[PDB]
RNA sequence: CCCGAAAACAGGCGGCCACCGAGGGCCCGGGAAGAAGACCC
RNA sequence: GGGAGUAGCAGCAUAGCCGGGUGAGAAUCCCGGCCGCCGUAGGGGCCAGGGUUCCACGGCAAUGUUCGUCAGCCGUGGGUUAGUCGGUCCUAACCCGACCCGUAACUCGGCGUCGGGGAAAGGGAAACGGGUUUAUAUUCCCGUACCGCGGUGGUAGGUGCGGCAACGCAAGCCCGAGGGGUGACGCCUCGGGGUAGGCGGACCGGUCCACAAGGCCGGCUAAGCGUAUAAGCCCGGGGAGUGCCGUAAUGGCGAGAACCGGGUGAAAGCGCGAAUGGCCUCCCGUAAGGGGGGUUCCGCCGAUCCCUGGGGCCCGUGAAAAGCCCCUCGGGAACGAUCCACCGCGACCGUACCGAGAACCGACACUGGUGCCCCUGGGUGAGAAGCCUAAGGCGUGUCGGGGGAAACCCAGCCGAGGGAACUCGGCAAAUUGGCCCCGUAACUUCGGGAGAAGGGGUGCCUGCGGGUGUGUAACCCGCAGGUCGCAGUGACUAGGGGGGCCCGACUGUUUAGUAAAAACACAGGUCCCAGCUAGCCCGAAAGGGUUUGUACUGGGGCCGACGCCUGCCCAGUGCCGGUAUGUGAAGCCCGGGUACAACCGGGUGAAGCACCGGUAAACGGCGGGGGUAACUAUAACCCUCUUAAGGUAGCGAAAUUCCUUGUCGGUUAAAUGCCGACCUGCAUGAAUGGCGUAACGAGGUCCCCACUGUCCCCGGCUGGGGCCCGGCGAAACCUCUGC
RNA sequence: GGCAGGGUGAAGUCCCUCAACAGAGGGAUGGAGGCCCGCUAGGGGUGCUGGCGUGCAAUUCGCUCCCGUGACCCCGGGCUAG
RNA sequence: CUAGUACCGUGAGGGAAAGCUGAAAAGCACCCCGGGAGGGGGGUGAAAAGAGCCUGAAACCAGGCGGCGAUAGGAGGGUGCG
RNA sequence: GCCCCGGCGAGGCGCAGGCAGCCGUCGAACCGGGGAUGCCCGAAUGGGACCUCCCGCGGCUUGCCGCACUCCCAGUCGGG
């Protein structure tokens, strides 16, 4: 038969390539070699809109001149002075180890191992629960409703992602869709598979029906994963 | 449709262009090999024994 | 016209000849006027022109006569208060 | 009423010439006639 | 060979005639005149591509749809001159090499490091006018300039000033470092200041016009050098709320307004360049050549060209680097420029011509495509519309001559009376039409429908008033009166309207070359997987896409704006979870056997199967009877046994109905039609969505008004063919023949 | 690198009058939109089932019709290969 | 034989045709016509074999010669005669 | 097409039947043998190639030599 559109994606072309020429860098952290215990301070230049982080970004200026961009808290304001270790205050906008932000705390930008630089909580409009501490590990609600486990060193930074609030308002065009997801390279406009021919999809054929389940097992090999991937239920409630 | 009126779009560009090792107008502008010789792509000669090419050059049989 | 000048970036001119012809001449576009670190004001005191235009030109004519030329004069009285006030003890 | 001497018994009558030349055509000015030819003055 | 001296040499731009010349020879070549076509392109400039087609002389065997003395053809000789135009320099998306890992291996595949490439329309030092040649010129010559590098001599400065300030100044040299700016950016909309170009009046010369009145032509000024304001932004003084100040509009003010002064700061204009330079014209021998004159003023319109400022939109944010300017710091010497004057030097490649109804691609001197890529005077007029016309170009969208010369065809004009009787079907044609005023329905998502529908007026001349403006300048808005015609948006330009039904919400897309749609997409609704070494995917592997990403996220299905709603079934098929037992391959263990093995029997044995449960906006299903209460039909109510359950709300002779032209009603003189209902639903039904719906549709279908050669019934006219004459000159096809 | 000219008139910003327990009327400014007319350029291809159909053309011509500030049209440099 | 040549295709690739005067150039002096290709006279040679060149077949074309030929019916021939 | 040693012994100047002229008895043309010159690209190699063309750094004295990658012997010279 022919491929997939999920085949094609794989190898890695234009029609699927993200275009990160176009996005302000990358958002790390300070590595922990120079922050030992070192404690370094910072001041905000100026706030910007990135293309490809779903959130706004925040330039600041730190020690030894050096730039970095970071994911920016509600309500930071040019010209404000951010702290990142051990002995930092507790405040919006704080890099602080787990260990020493109390139970209670709304937290964002966590680290999985300690000096990764920042997985968890970076989309705009989230936030996280600091639950429980111990000496073995940190218990955190994530906004999946996930409670996990950290290492109390793992960094993470005090507040809200900022940015929230963008699907009160409806997309109402073809048009603006189109834009929307010409910025980042989707795939767009999106087919209908029991609307294709019998080569291009599982689905397929003249009469428009799914002939069958669309339930598919885990263990079903590519080409054929389609409809409802090992689903535990179906319907609305 | 697809015949006579798309034939005036032949005023681009070129595919090939003249090769400096080989000699002749099948050196790839844009992807920078030649699809003779091979010149660009390796430093041997490309030689393939279903082709008829270079017995006819050295008047070979086949 | 040339593709080069079907270009936009040239700011063509009509101008009539001696003779009686009225050509057309082009001309690159001017650089825009210098701007002060933090505020972003214009600042006075500072021609605009192209390389050609500001080599011609000698030093004192290019800039003011005054500490932090390139800042504003706000600015500039902000940070020399500063480090007087600094230099206390 | 219309077509009709190629009706192979391929007709009848009157008149003219032959046994240089009766007659006919091209040509010229034109329609009442007309695709070329033909027809009429 | 026959076809045949036949077809074709028409249709989309119908173009030639008179006189003279050359020459063996002229419808077709040259000169003049008349007549015509294009005129926001058939005119001008120039990419790519082509490659000598460019220029002059000499020719006509072939080529050119005919001829040819002509030529993009043939032959002989010629022709492209750069410090300033472009390439070289920077980097973008992207590519290559070396090392490295993989591969049986490679001219194969790949991450990261180093290095290198990558734009003749992105960034980016520096020149303008005139003349000269058969053919080149921002390249040659004359005149007047500029840039870089390197020097010669002086000077500012080192070791100096004016201003409260904003700032103004010639304001030291050589190496390195750091910082700031510039280069450097989207879409929409508006104001101000200018320019190219155009219009009017006067004057000077020339020219056309029976006089007169009048009309047309010309009346010029480059780079560079030197000189300023506007906006905006700043500096001093000043000291405000029942408020003042201002814009086309938004607006501004103790976080310092009005008001008074000043600084900085564009495009332009002015001056030198530069007037025996260019243009126009006037006088004698005409070979070189002679002399003379003019080159003036006012006033309007005005860009899609240049500069400068505001405002609005983004779930969308609209390049980088080289190069250039300034400041600070560190280290050096005592000299010495970013100022003035002078000298020297500046490599390599391109440069001819076409740029398309004959120089490109399409086999062609092809109505196609590439390129409409950039630009264009006057009138009417909203107008880059159509019509007429100036410049410029053409008569080469390369065969001509005859004609009452028919029939018939192609493209057009008019038709008495009737007005769709034509036809599957009003196909085609016709009707309306611009501007101002009056007036405007159902329905509606209150936004629309809507230019609904429908009605009245419009020319020319003579005057009178208004608006902005200094204006007897310019551009616009009204009034009265007189008068002509069949007709006054008189040509050109320029909507036929209305009422029902089906489908699809809309703008958009599609089978290049028989299907443009009811098919696709769409915003939106709902379901599924996934906490990152994830989920989904590529690959032989190494590695990789989503990922410069982290649940307001990424990936995977179905339905399809909006409004009201979305009923029952987990027995089957599938997916998910759980579990004691059972089954369960290799391996392991035990026994028997084999001097050892092969071999025989049993036990244990994961996943999976089996077993137990959840799930229908998962695939799908929603039947059967045996009986009916009061006389004509009713099974409308209640038990039952089959099976997991037994079609809920709605809709229904349907784009689904067989019998079918179902029955009733409305529309016709007449109805296999359309609309509305009735249920006997062969074989409707709820996200394979059900029922409605304003607005929209080159979708499909029925009716009405107007209108018409569709039709009764055909007739007349125009241009191009057809016919004849001269010229060039095929093909399909063909057993031999032919009542 | 491009898209003549014209219409309708969303938000935003206001003004006047009578008033007055309430309210009732009337005038402007401003320029949005996958809006409207439009052979501007440019793009497409509905009907005539027109011309042609050994064609001008191995998909063209004419009349009629559709979009035309956007999910628009086009150019130079690049990438995806049975 | 100026052949892997001309020519076709973006490219990978595909791919023709074309031999001979005479022993000797003795390769046609001179004249008339014609704008000219050339024609007619004359010449060289044993023979025009004339460069459009050894021999020079058939199909096909024109002219001359012989037979038939405008009241007439069969695949074009066979038998017998005139 | 230039030079030398041998052979052959008068003509020669390619396929190629021409014009005008040169070379050769100091031994040519031709034949056997040995030398010189030998542009650009190309393994292509000092560095780059959208056009077989461009751009350099050292040392010597305008002309010459050296200057790629993967290795061996060495060693901051060199030889393969
Ligand atoms: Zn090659
Ligand atoms: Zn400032
Ligand atoms: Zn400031």
């Given at each position: 038969?022919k491929?997939?559109?999920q085949?094609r994606?794989?190898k890695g072309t ?9 996005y302000?860098?990358?958002?790390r952290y300070?590595?922990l ?6 404690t ?8 910007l809109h990135?293309?490809?982080?779903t959130?706004?970004?925040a ?6 001149g ?5 994911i920016?808290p ?6 404000q ?10 405040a919006?906008?704080?890099?602080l180890?787990?260990?020493?932000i109390?139970?209670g705390?709304?937290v964002?930008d966590?680290?999985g ?9 970076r989309?705009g409009?989230?936030?996280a ?6 000496k073995?590990?940190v ?23 900022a ?7 409806p ?14 390279n ?14 291009n999809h599982?689905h ?8 069958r389940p ?11 994963k389609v ?11 | 449709?697809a ?16 090769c400096?090792?080989?000699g002749?107008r099948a050196?790839?502008?844009?992807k920078?090999?030649?699809?003779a ?8 000669m490309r030689?393939?024994?279903?082709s ?11 | ?6 270009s936009?970036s040239w ?6 000849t001696?003779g009686?012809?009225?050509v057309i001449h082009?001309?690159?576009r ?5 701007h002060?670190?933090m ?9 605009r ?21 390139n800042?504003?004069?706000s600015c ?10 600094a230099?206390?003890?």
């Amino acid at each position: 038969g022919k491929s997939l559109i999920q085949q094609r994606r794989g190898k890695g072309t234009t029609t699927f390539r993200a275009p990160s020429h176009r996005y302000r860098g990358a958002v790390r952290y300070v590595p922990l070699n120079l922050v030992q215990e070192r404690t370094l301070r910072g001041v905000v230049e100026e706030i910007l809109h990135d293309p490809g982080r779903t959130a706004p970004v925040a330039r600041v200026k730190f020690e030894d001149g050096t730039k970095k961009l970071i994911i920016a808290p509600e309500g930071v304001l040019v010209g404000q002075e951010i702290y990142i270790g051990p002995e930092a205050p507790i405040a919006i906008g704080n890099t602080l180890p787990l260990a020493k932000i109390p139970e209670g705390t709304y937290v964002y930008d966590i680290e999985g191992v300690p000096g990764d630089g920042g997985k968890y909580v970076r989309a705009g409009g989230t936030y996280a629960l600091v639950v429980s501490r111990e000496k073995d590990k940190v218990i955190v609600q994530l906004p999946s409703g996930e409670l996990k486990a950290f290492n109390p060193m793992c960094r993470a930074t005090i507040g809200v992602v900022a940015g929230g609030g963008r699907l009160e308002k409806p997309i109402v065009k073809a048009g603006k869709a189109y834009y929307i997801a010409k910025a980042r390279n989707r795939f767009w406009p999106k087919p209908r598979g029991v609307k294709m021919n019998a080569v291009n999809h599982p689905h397929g054929g003249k009469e428009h029906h799914i002939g069958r389940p669309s339930t598919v097992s885990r263990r079903a090999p590519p080409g054929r994963k389609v409809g409802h991937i090992a689903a535990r239920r179906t319907g609305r409630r | 449709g697809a015949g006579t009126a798309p034939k005036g779009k032949r005023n681009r560009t070129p595919t090939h262009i003249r090769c400096r090792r080989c000699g002749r107008r099948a050196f790839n502008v844009k992807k920078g090999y030649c699809a003779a010789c091979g010149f660009g792509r390796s430093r041997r000669m490309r030689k393939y024994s279903w082709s008829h090419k270079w017995r006819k050059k050295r008047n070979l049989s086949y | 016209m040339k593709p080069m000048y079907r270009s936009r970036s040239w700011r063509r001119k009509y101008v009539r000849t001696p003779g009686g012809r009225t050509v057309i001449h082009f001309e690159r576009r001017k650089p825009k006027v210098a701007h002060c670190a933090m505020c972003g004001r214009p600042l006075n005191g500072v021609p605009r022109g192209r390389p050609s235009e500001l080599r011609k030109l000698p030093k004192t004519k290019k800039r003011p006569e005054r500490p932090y030329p390139n800042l504003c004069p706000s600015c500039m009285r902000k940070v020399m208060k500063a480090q007087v006030r600094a230099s206390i003890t």
